[model samples]
Every structure is written in structure tokens, then in C-alpha cells.
Target: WCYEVQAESSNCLVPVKWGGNCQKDRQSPINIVTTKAKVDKKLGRFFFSGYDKKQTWTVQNNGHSVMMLLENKASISGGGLPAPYQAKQLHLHWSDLPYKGSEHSLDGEHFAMEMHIVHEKEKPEDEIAVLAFLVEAGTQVNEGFQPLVEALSNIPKPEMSTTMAESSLLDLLPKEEKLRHYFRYLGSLTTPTCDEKVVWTVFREPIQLHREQILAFSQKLYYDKEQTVSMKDNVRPLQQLGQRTVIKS
Candidate 1:
């Protein structure tokens, strides 16, 4: 009933049924074919407010992923959005070395990790917007990620929470210039009850973290308090992208 499978199994690549509209069209975490994406110059630059200021944040291992709650509402606007959306929370989907853990793929290729910045509109009835960033293990360290990665040490058990070192959202994201080249599309949430009400923005550049830092997620934490199962591969396989257009800017 869970997405805990070996990397080599074909079953791991196939989608699992977790109820709700997961089987419907316009699902998320799609394989975005770069060449197939329609280019749009109007997508423009996104205005990110309050993202560069350092702040205290709460990070928790909620038996699913290491989710960190945002404070003071850092918001994003423009870039062809229907409305400005405030970031709610951010979380990661990852696996250990040799296995790709990113929920979405590029040209059928996957990465070591993916970070999702979940945002909400002012009106409750509007569609949910999510900004996704892919992450890969690299030789050089991403100092910006040091605080969050170090915080994982104290959260070995599920439901365990800790406060991370003061850091800004911009520190974890790619340089401002790299942010301009992104892909946009309409899709569903990548979780159960996968409703088709999400406006997705996948950044073109991938965040690079040290190999040990990436391994810390799969090694330092466990899915169960019994400490038997390591918290890895908590990602749903990519779903079908039916009758949807991926826009590039």
C-alpha cells in the first residue's frame, strides 16, 4: 500500500493506486519532454518578495518527508500567474545513491532529489500553485543547504521536529538569472487525492548538494520509530500527462 520498493523492480516505475483522482488526466510529476514544451516569451520573470531575508523555521519529519514550514509568508507573483501565491511549506522527495528520487523528470531523466515549494492563492477556491526544483549530488557543497541538512541529525524518528539555522529561501534556489528559464503547465498534486487543480512551475536548473548531504536524508532518518525502515523512496512514480501543454519561457 506504500511506495516502498526496490529501485530495479519494474513495479517501482509503475504507478500505484492510492485512491481519489490519481488515475485521472492532467496528473503531476510528469515526464516533461523539453522539445515538446511550447515556448512562451510572455512567461516572464517572477517577482519574489521576502525571499532573501533570513528567518527561523520549523522542520519536521512527518513520516512522509522532511517538511519545513515557512514563516511571514514569502510570496511570488507575475511570470504568467493568475494571482500572486504565498508559499505555504516546502518539502523534499528523495532516495539514496544510484536511484533517482525526483518526482518529475526531464527528457525522461530523473535526479537525486526534488524540492517542492507549495503555495496558495488568496481565494480558497482558486487553483494551487507549486514551484519545483530538482537537486543532484555534486562534488562541491552547497553551503546554503548546510543548515537544513545538519538539522536532520536530530530528527531520526518520525514526527520529530527541530528548528533550523536562520536561512533565506533565495539561498537554496538557483541564481536569479537561472530562474528565468522555467517550464509551466497545468497538473495535479503528486500525492494521494491527487486533484487536478495545480499550476506547476519546474525550474530548469538543478540544485547541487554534496554527496554526503544528499545521503544524510536517506541515512539519518527512518520512516518508523522502530528504526527498522530508512526513509527513502517516498516518491510517487510519474503520472501520465494527457492533453496538457508544457510551456517554456
Candidate 2:
């Protein structure tokens, strides 16, 4: 379904049913209040297996976002998680210039872009977790994302897919030291059918990408592959926090 139809607007086909919990309390993309975040002493650093190795990823424009589907061979453990969560997919969220694009913010400060690496447990009863990293423009170029960036040009239309080579999961994340400090909370997915089954771990530090790279994503992508409309900003607004407590490590 289209975003407009899924939104709780007058044109919506399902009305307020667009988001499963759009009007609920435990929604995602909250403005993280750093001062109120409780420090969890038991929280430890996360460990990633098979993330550093080169792997083939399927990159596609899924009409909503540019998603990179992982091979599920890699997995992450620790970081307050009960068990290892296998990597499923990764996606990007960005907006037009002069506007903060990130879904979550730090003390009301939003970044130019955001990236989410989604993971799921092996057992059906296990929970889903997401590793979110903020992206900011910088003078230095990121050589790691070169292949994925080049692949974007080849897949400008919806449902179009491309194969990315030598893609390393390590290159997509911040340093290990930065991973030690992050905000963890119980929230829902940021999109339609927003299920309240996510454990969000938003990193404290932001990664740097050259201006050209940021512009390439913001300007080159399209909302519809067949249409000329540019997909500049594809982020949802911040939701309410309610009774949830955000923990920091």
C-alpha cells in the first residue's frame, strides 16, 4: 500500500488502522531525552560474528526505501540481548537539505540521515532488535560504502535489484568503542503495520559521509521508478514515548 493510504489522513482507506499502534503509547522515533536516560550498569558491549567478512548483498528499491538484504549468516549477541539475533536486512532514511532527516534524535538534535540494521531471533518467541546509526555530512569520503553507492545508480526504479560485492558489515557501523554507548528502548517499527515487537539500540555516535555521497542519496533516488518525482525525504515524524524508559549504556 502507498504511504498516503497507510497514513491516518482523510484519504486513508483504513483510517487510523494504518499503523497498528499509530495512536498507541509505545511507538518509535521518539526524541531521546539524554538527561532522563538511565545508565544501565549491566549493559555490556555487543559482539558480532561474520560482520567483518566480505559478503554478497541484494540491494533493492522497495518503493519505500533502499534496502540491502543480508545473507543471514552473520549474527550479533550480548548488548543486553537474551540470545544471538541474526542479521536480516538494512535500510536507509533521509530527507531534503535544511531538514533533519533522522527518525530518532538526541536531545532534539537530528542528523541528515539514519541507517537501521534489523535483526531477528532464531526462535519464534525471541524478540526483534534494530541497530540504528546516525549519518552526518563530512569532508572526508567513506571508501567503505563506495560499492553500495555505485549500485544505487543501477537500481533507480522500484523492485529493481542489484548485487553488491565485497560488502562488509563492519564498514557500515561505527567503531567498537562507540557501540558500547547507546540508547536502548522498547519501541515499534517505524513503518506501516508498525508492530510493537522491536528492541531499539540507537548508537551514540554518528558516521561521516562526504557531501557528494549524501547528495547522491537525497537527490538521485525517486519515489516511483516510473515517475520523475524525487524521493528526497522518506522519514516518519517522532512518536510519543508514554511509559517506556530509555536506557543508556
Candidate 3:
């Protein structure tokens, strides 16, 4: 769900925001592909007893922590949606936008922060998912998100490409309820190797947070020094929908 926007131009493969030459062509399904999804709770955000479980594994620097757990070359995968992608690794991208700064737009509306639970379809296995959680301007920063906040303190913001200390991370979501009002579609990973098998799901429910909560993650890395502080909207332009029927469930 995390992607960068670039300049506009014909034959441009990079994504951009607003009306550009690429926007018109991306509306068609012909250029887009489709796939069915099956969600496995064990592999998804499970809020239990009002708290989600963390799935952490040991890893060396430079290796993708999320992907390692997902493929589990060692651990067995609990079932969820038959994600088109395997978990490559998960991360977040937010703006200092104290108001609203989400990357993906819902029916033309954007939220504040964008969280990407990135995954990939196994090459030989072909299971893919680019799970997303949008954090909006709200109150009561969920206490459940503490671990992630703690983790970010080490890496900070805009530290793209830098791997941090390994830990069980996904336990951030509260288990009070299953994720609700989600939008799903086939799209490419926002990064360079932009694979087309990615199955993206944007949650309709926004997370509540305070300034300190936002500031906890408002870290600016070495690369994004000038990047806006508040959620300035980071969702890359959407890929073509093709003939596939994007759904909201």
C-alpha cells in the first residue's frame, strides 16, 4: 500500500497523483489483472481479548523480517485469506499532517497516516497480500500500538531501506473487533520491483491517535528530511483496475 509519487510524463511507469497522462490509462482493466482472495485470521490482524498477538522472529540486519515470518521456511502459516502475496515485510509511511494524510483515497477521500503490512505471493507458492491500515486524525492513541511505536523510535522516519532490530511486530491492532469496511483490489507493490500480484486491502476504520502518538512515528529519516511532517498523503497513483471488480467488504 506504500508507494512514492513521481513526475508526470508519457510512457512513465512511475505513479503520480491527480490528473495526469497515466491516470486515464490506469482506469481500464485491460492493463490490470484480477484474482480471488481468501483471508486466514492466523495470518491477518487478529484482535484478541482486545489485543492482537505479535508474530515476531529473529533475523539479521538487511533481511526482511515480515517476509521471513510469512514464508516461514520454518514456521507453518495459519490460514487467512489466500493472499496473492507472501509477507515480504511490513512498514509505515505517514505525513506530519495533523489533520489527514493518507495515501489511498476512498471514493475521493484520504485519511491521515498510511500503514502498510506488506507481503508478497510466494514465488513457488504464490500467496500474496499487501495489507494496509489507515491512521486518521483522532483521539486516544490505541495503547495496543505501543510496540510499533517503540520499534519506530529506533529506526525513525524516512529510513527507507534500513532494517531494524528484529521483533514480533503485528500485535499492534486491538482485538476488540475484526477489521471492518475494507476495500480490496489487485495492485502492484509501490516499490521498484512492483510486482503485479499484490492484493491490497485498505481498512475503512481509522485508528485514533494523539499528537505524541503521531509524533512517536513522526520520525524523519536521512532521506526524507524535507518531507512534510503530518500525513501529507503518500499513496501512489492507483494502477489500472482492468476488468477486475474491486470490492469493499
Each candidate: what lDDT? Answer: 0.85, 0.81, 0.44
Number of the candidate with higher TM-score, 1 or 2:
1
All candidates: CA RMSD (Å): 3.2, 2.9, 7.8
| TM-scores, one per candidate | 0.92, 0.91, 0.59
- Distance from true position, residue 142, model 1, in Å? 0.6
TM-score, model 1 to reference = 0.92
Let me know the TM-score candidate 3 reaches against the reference structure.
0.59
For model 3, the superposed segments whose C-alpha errors exceed 4 Å read 1-80, 83-86, 98-100, 122-127, 156-170, 174-176, 224-234, 238-243
lDDT of 2 by residue, 23-120 (tens): 67788889999999999987789999989999878999887789998869789999888889999999988876634778899999999899999999
Identify the candidate with maximal TM-score.
1
Worst 10 residues of 3 by lDDT: 59-68
The Cα error of candidate 2 at residue 56, in Å, is: 2.2
Question: Tens-digit lDDT track for model 1 on 1-249?
Answer: 356453333222224656788878778889999999999978999999888989878999987789889853699898788788888899999998534889999998899999999888755223788999999987898999988998998899989999999998888999999999999998888877788888899999999998988999998987777877788897888878878789999
Q: Order the candidates by lDDT, highest first.
A: 1, 2, 3
Angstrom error of the Cα, residue 111, model 2: value is: 0.5
Best model number under lDDT: 1
